[PDB]
Amino acid sequence: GSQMTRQARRLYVGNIPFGITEEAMMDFFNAQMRLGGLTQAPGNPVLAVQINQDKNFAFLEFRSVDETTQAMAFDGIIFQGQSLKIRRPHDYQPENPSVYVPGVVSTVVPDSAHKLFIGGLPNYLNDDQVKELLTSFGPLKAFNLVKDSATGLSKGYAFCEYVDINVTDQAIAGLNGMQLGDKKLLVQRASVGAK
């Protein structure tokens, strides 16, 4: 495509499932965007995928600026149990999707009054599983399971924010102290124990 808009037609995709091929990634995004009506014309919006195997991220290149922007709305989409972290390239300079997709929960969890910290999670649970645990109390607005920056594996804690701020206290009362195997969950507002 045009060299002039290249930076506005590419996205960083982190937290990709181990072993995923570039072809699988491309088919997944192309399918998800088409099935979701996130396309502006017939055909496949994603033109290329470059995976960095060692760091578990990919860069996707799109055929248009507007479809790239729409793809940002898939941040947090679940792919093989993993919440995909979709971000602009750091060298991108304008941009906000004009359509939200059901069933996608952002992985951007800004510090805020009702941001929750969830500690003591068993390390074998994937994003989808921890998210299902939390969504028992209500729909989430944002969620991120912290991963080992070397192996991409869970570090045993997460942060989230519910759509309804009133669920925050219900989740604390229900989950704080709960026993999971030998672990005991710590669920509190993240501001309380922030570094």
Short mmCIF file of all heavy atoms in Angstrom, two decimals, residues 50-84, unseen atoms left out:
data_model
loop_
_atom_site.label_atom_id
_atom_site.label_comp_id
_atom_site.label_asym_id
_atom_site.label_seq_id
_atom_site.Cartn_x
_atom_site.Cartn_y
_atom_site.Cartn_z
N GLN A 50 3.24 -9.91 10.63
CA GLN A 50 4.63 -10.21 10.96
C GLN A 50 4.70 -10.53 12.45
O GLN A 50 4.50 -9.65 13.29
CB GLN A 50 5.55 -9.04 10.62
N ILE A 51 4.97 -11.79 12.78
CA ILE A 51 5.02 -12.25 14.16
C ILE A 51 6.47 -12.23 14.65
O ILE A 51 7.37 -12.70 13.95
CB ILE A 51 4.42 -13.65 14.32
CG1 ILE A 51 2.90 -13.59 14.16
CG2 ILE A 51 4.79 -14.25 15.67
CD1 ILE A 51 2.23 -14.95 14.05
N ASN A 52 6.68 -11.68 15.84
CA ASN A 52 7.95 -11.83 16.55
C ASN A 52 7.77 -13.02 17.49
O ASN A 52 7.10 -12.92 18.53
CB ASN A 52 8.32 -10.56 17.30
CG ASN A 52 9.70 -10.64 17.94
OD1 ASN A 52 9.99 -11.56 18.71
ND2 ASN A 52 10.56 -9.68 17.62
N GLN A 53 8.36 -14.16 17.12
CA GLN A 53 8.13 -15.39 17.87
C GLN A 53 8.64 -15.27 19.30
O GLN A 53 8.01 -15.76 20.24
CB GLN A 53 8.82 -16.57 17.17
CG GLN A 53 8.52 -16.69 15.67
CD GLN A 53 7.13 -17.23 15.38
OE1 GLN A 53 6.42 -17.67 16.29
NE2 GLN A 53 6.74 -17.20 14.12
N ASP A 54 9.78 -14.60 19.48
CA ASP A 54 10.44 -14.57 20.79
C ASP A 54 9.66 -13.76 21.81
O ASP A 54 9.73 -14.05 23.01
CB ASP A 54 11.85 -14.02 20.65
N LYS A 55 8.91 -12.74 21.37
CA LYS A 55 8.25 -11.82 22.28
C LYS A 55 6.73 -11.91 22.24
O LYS A 55 6.06 -11.14 22.94
CB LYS A 55 8.69 -10.38 21.98
CG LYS A 55 10.20 -10.19 21.97
CD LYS A 55 10.59 -8.79 22.40
CE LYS A 55 12.06 -8.52 22.13
NZ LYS A 55 12.92 -9.69 22.49
N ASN A 56 6.17 -12.82 21.45
CA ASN A 56 4.73 -13.06 21.43
C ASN A 56 3.94 -11.82 21.04
O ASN A 56 2.90 -11.51 21.62
CB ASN A 56 4.24 -13.58 22.79
CG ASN A 56 4.75 -14.97 23.12
OD1 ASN A 56 4.78 -15.85 22.27
ND2 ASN A 56 5.15 -15.17 24.37
N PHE A 57 4.42 -11.10 20.03
CA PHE A 57 3.63 -10.02 19.45
C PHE A 57 3.68 -10.11 17.93
O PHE A 57 4.51 -10.80 17.35
CB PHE A 57 4.09 -8.62 19.93
CG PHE A 57 5.41 -8.16 19.37
CD1 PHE A 57 5.49 -7.58 18.12
CD2 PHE A 57 6.57 -8.28 20.12
CE1 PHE A 57 6.70 -7.15 17.61
CE2 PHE A 57 7.78 -7.85 19.62
CZ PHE A 57 7.85 -7.28 18.36
N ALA A 58 2.74 -9.40 17.31
CA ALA A 58 2.66 -9.32 15.86
C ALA A 58 2.40 -7.87 15.47
O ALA A 58 1.85 -7.10 16.26
CB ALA A 58 1.55 -10.22 15.30
N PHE A 59 2.79 -7.52 14.26
CA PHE A 59 2.31 -6.31 13.62
C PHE A 59 1.43 -6.72 12.45
O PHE A 59 1.81 -7.58 11.65
CB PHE A 59 3.47 -5.42 13.17
CG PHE A 59 3.93 -4.47 14.24
CD1 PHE A 59 4.91 -4.85 15.13
CD2 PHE A 59 3.36 -3.21 14.36
CE1 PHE A 59 5.33 -3.99 16.12
CE2 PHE A 59 3.78 -2.35 15.35
CZ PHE A 59 4.77 -2.73 16.23
N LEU A 60 0.23 -6.16 12.42
CA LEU A 60 -0.70 -6.36 11.32
C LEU A 60 -0.67 -5.13 10.43
O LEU A 60 -0.60 -4.00 10.92
CB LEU A 60 -2.13 -6.57 11.81
CG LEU A 60 -2.43 -7.51 12.97
CD1 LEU A 60 -3.91 -7.90 12.95
CD2 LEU A 60 -1.55 -8.74 12.92
N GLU A 61 -0.73 -5.34 9.12
CA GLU A 61 -0.87 -4.26 8.16
C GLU A 61 -2.23 -4.37 7.49
O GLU A 61 -2.64 -5.47 7.09
CB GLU A 61 0.24 -4.27 7.11
CG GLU A 61 0.22 -3.02 6.24
CD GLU A 61 1.29 -3.01 5.18
OE1 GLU A 61 2.17 -3.90 5.20
OE2 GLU A 61 1.26 -2.11 4.31
N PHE A 62 -2.92 -3.25 7.37
CA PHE A 62 -4.27 -3.18 6.85
C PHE A 62 -4.29 -2.44 5.52
O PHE A 62 -3.38 -1.66 5.20
CB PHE A 62 -5.20 -2.46 7.83
CG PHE A 62 -5.32 -3.16 9.15
CD1 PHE A 62 -4.33 -3.05 10.10
CD2 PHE A 62 -6.44 -3.94 9.43
CE1 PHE A 62 -4.44 -3.70 11.31
CE2 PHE A 62 -6.55 -4.58 10.64
CZ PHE A 62 -5.55 -4.46 11.58
N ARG A 63 -5.34 -2.67 4.75
CA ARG A 63 -5.44 -2.05 3.44
C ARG A 63 -5.90 -0.60 3.49
O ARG A 63 -5.77 0.10 2.49
CB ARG A 63 -6.40 -2.85 2.55
CG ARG A 63 -7.84 -2.77 2.99
CD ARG A 63 -8.73 -3.67 2.17
NE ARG A 63 -10.08 -3.67 2.74
CZ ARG A 63 -11.12 -4.32 2.23
NH1 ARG A 63 -10.98 -5.04 1.13
NH2 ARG A 63 -12.29 -4.25 2.83
N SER A 64 -6.43 -0.13 4.62
CA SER A 64 -6.92 1.24 4.66
C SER A 64 -6.75 1.82 6.05
O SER A 64 -6.69 1.10 7.05
CB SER A 64 -8.39 1.32 4.24
OG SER A 64 -9.26 0.93 5.29
N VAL A 65 -6.70 3.15 6.09
CA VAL A 65 -6.58 3.87 7.36
C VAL A 65 -7.82 3.66 8.21
O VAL A 65 -7.73 3.41 9.41
CB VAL A 65 -6.30 5.36 7.08
CG1 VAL A 65 -6.37 6.17 8.36
CG2 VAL A 65 -4.95 5.53 6.39
N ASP A 66 -9.01 3.77 7.60
CA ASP A 66 -10.24 3.70 8.38
C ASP A 66 -10.45 2.31 8.99
O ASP A 66 -10.95 2.19 10.11
CB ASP A 66 -11.45 4.08 7.52
CG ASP A 66 -11.58 5.58 7.32
OD1 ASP A 66 -10.83 6.34 7.96
OD2 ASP A 66 -12.44 5.99 6.51
N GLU A 67 -10.09 1.26 8.25
CA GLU A 67 -10.25 -0.09 8.79
C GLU A 67 -9.22 -0.37 9.88
O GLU A 67 -9.51 -1.10 10.83
CB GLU A 67 -10.17 -1.11 7.66
CG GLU A 67 -11.42 -1.11 6.80
CD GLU A 67 -11.31 -1.96 5.56
OE1 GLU A 67 -10.19 -2.10 5.02
OE2 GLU A 67 -12.35 -2.49 5.11
N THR A 68 -8.02 0.21 9.76
CA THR A 68 -7.05 0.12 10.85
C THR A 68 -7.62 0.71 12.13
O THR A 68 -7.58 0.08 13.19
CB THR A 68 -5.76 0.85 10.46
OG1 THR A 68 -5.24 0.30 9.24
CG2 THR A 68 -4.70 0.73 11.56
N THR A 69 -8.16 1.93 12.04
CA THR A 69 -8.77 2.56 13.20
C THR A 69 -9.88 1.70 13.78
O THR A 69 -10.01 1.58 15.01
CB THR A 69 -9.30 3.94 12.80
OG1 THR A 69 -8.20 4.77 12.39
CG2 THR A 69 -10.04 4.60 13.95
N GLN A 70 -10.71 1.10 12.92
CA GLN A 70 -11.77 0.23 13.42
C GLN A 70 -11.20 -0.99 14.14
O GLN A 70 -11.77 -1.47 15.12
CB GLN A 70 -12.67 -0.20 12.26
CG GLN A 70 -13.78 -1.17 12.66
CD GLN A 70 -14.77 -0.56 13.63
OE1 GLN A 70 -15.44 0.42 13.32
NE2 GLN A 70 -14.85 -1.14 14.83
N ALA A 71 -10.07 -1.51 13.65
CA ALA A 71 -9.45 -2.68 14.26
C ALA A 71 -9.05 -2.42 15.71
O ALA A 71 -8.99 -3.35 16.51
CB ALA A 71 -8.24 -3.12 13.44
N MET A 72 -8.76 -1.16 16.05
CA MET A 72 -8.44 -0.83 17.44
C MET A 72 -9.57 -1.24 18.38
O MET A 72 -9.31 -1.54 19.56
CB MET A 72 -8.18 0.67 17.57
CG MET A 72 -6.88 1.14 16.96
SD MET A 72 -5.44 0.69 17.96
CE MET A 72 -5.64 1.79 19.36
N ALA A 73 -10.81 -1.26 17.89
CA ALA A 73 -11.94 -1.65 18.73
C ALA A 73 -11.92 -3.12 19.09
O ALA A 73 -12.70 -3.54 19.96
CB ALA A 73 -13.25 -1.30 18.02
N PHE A 74 -11.07 -3.93 18.46
CA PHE A 74 -10.92 -5.33 18.83
C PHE A 74 -9.93 -5.52 19.98
O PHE A 74 -9.67 -6.67 20.36
CB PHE A 74 -10.46 -6.16 17.63
CG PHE A 74 -11.59 -6.70 16.79
CD1 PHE A 74 -11.33 -7.22 15.53
CD2 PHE A 74 -12.91 -6.70 17.24
CE1 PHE A 74 -12.35 -7.72 14.74
CE2 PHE A 74 -13.93 -7.20 16.45
CZ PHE A 74 -13.65 -7.71 15.20
N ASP A 75 -9.36 -4.45 20.52
CA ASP A 75 -8.47 -4.60 21.66
C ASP A 75 -9.17 -5.38 22.76
O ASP A 75 -10.23 -4.98 23.25
CB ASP A 75 -8.02 -3.23 22.19
CG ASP A 75 -7.26 -3.35 23.50
OD1 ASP A 75 -6.27 -4.11 23.55
OD2 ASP A 75 -7.65 -2.68 24.47
N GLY A 76 -8.57 -6.50 23.15
CA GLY A 76 -9.13 -7.36 24.16
C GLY A 76 -9.89 -8.55 23.63
O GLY A 76 -10.31 -9.40 24.41
N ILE A 77 -10.08 -8.63 22.31
CA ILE A 77 -10.73 -9.79 21.73
C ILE A 77 -10.00 -11.04 22.18
O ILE A 77 -8.77 -11.06 22.31
CB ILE A 77 -10.77 -9.67 20.19
CG1 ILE A 77 -11.68 -10.74 19.60
CG2 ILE A 77 -9.37 -9.75 19.61
CD1 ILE A 77 -11.92 -10.58 18.12
N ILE A 78 -10.77 -12.09 22.46
CA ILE A 78 -10.21 -13.36 22.91
C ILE A 78 -9.83 -14.18 21.69
O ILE A 78 -10.63 -14.33 20.75
CB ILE A 78 -11.20 -14.12 23.80
CG1 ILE A 78 -11.52 -13.33 25.07
CG2 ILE A 78 -10.64 -15.49 24.14
CD1 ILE A 78 -10.35 -13.14 26.00
N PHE A 79 -8.62 -14.73 21.70
CA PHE A 79 -8.10 -15.57 20.63
C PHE A 79 -7.39 -16.72 21.32
O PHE A 79 -6.37 -16.51 21.97
CB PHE A 79 -7.16 -14.78 19.72
CG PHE A 79 -6.64 -15.55 18.53
CD1 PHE A 79 -7.35 -16.61 17.99
CD2 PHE A 79 -5.43 -15.20 17.96
CE1 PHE A 79 -6.86 -17.30 16.89
CE2 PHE A 79 -4.94 -15.89 16.87
CZ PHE A 79 -5.65 -16.94 16.33
N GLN A 80 -7.94 -17.93 21.20
CA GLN A 80 -7.36 -19.11 21.84
C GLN A 80 -7.06 -18.85 23.31
O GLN A 80 -5.97 -19.12 23.82
CB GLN A 80 -6.09 -19.54 21.10
CG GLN A 80 -6.31 -19.95 19.66
CD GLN A 80 -6.99 -21.30 19.53
OE1 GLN A 80 -6.59 -22.27 20.16
NE2 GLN A 80 -8.03 -21.36 18.70
N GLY A 81 -8.05 -18.29 24.01
CA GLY A 81 -7.93 -18.06 25.43
C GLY A 81 -7.17 -16.81 25.82
O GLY A 81 -7.10 -16.51 27.02
N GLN A 82 -6.61 -16.08 24.86
CA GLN A 82 -5.76 -14.93 25.13
C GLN A 82 -6.48 -13.63 24.79
O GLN A 82 -7.12 -13.53 23.73
CB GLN A 82 -4.47 -15.01 24.30
CG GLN A 82 -3.68 -16.27 24.49
CD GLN A 82 -2.77 -16.20 25.69
OE1 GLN A 82 -2.97 -16.91 26.67
NE2 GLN A 82 -1.77 -15.33 25.63
N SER A 83 -6.37 -12.65 25.68
CA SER A 83 -6.87 -11.30 25.40
C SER A 83 -5.84 -10.58 24.54
O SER A 83 -4.76 -10.21 25.03
CB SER A 83 -7.12 -10.53 26.69
OG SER A 83 -8.05 -11.19 27.51
N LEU A 84 -6.15 -10.36 23.27
CA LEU A 84 -5.20 -9.68 22.39
C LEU A 84 -5.09 -8.21 22.77
O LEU A 84 -6.09 -7.51 22.93
CB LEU A 84 -5.63 -9.81 20.94
CG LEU A 84 -5.75 -11.23 20.39
CD1 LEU A 84 -6.01 -11.18 18.89
CD2 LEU A 84 -4.51 -12.05 20.69
#
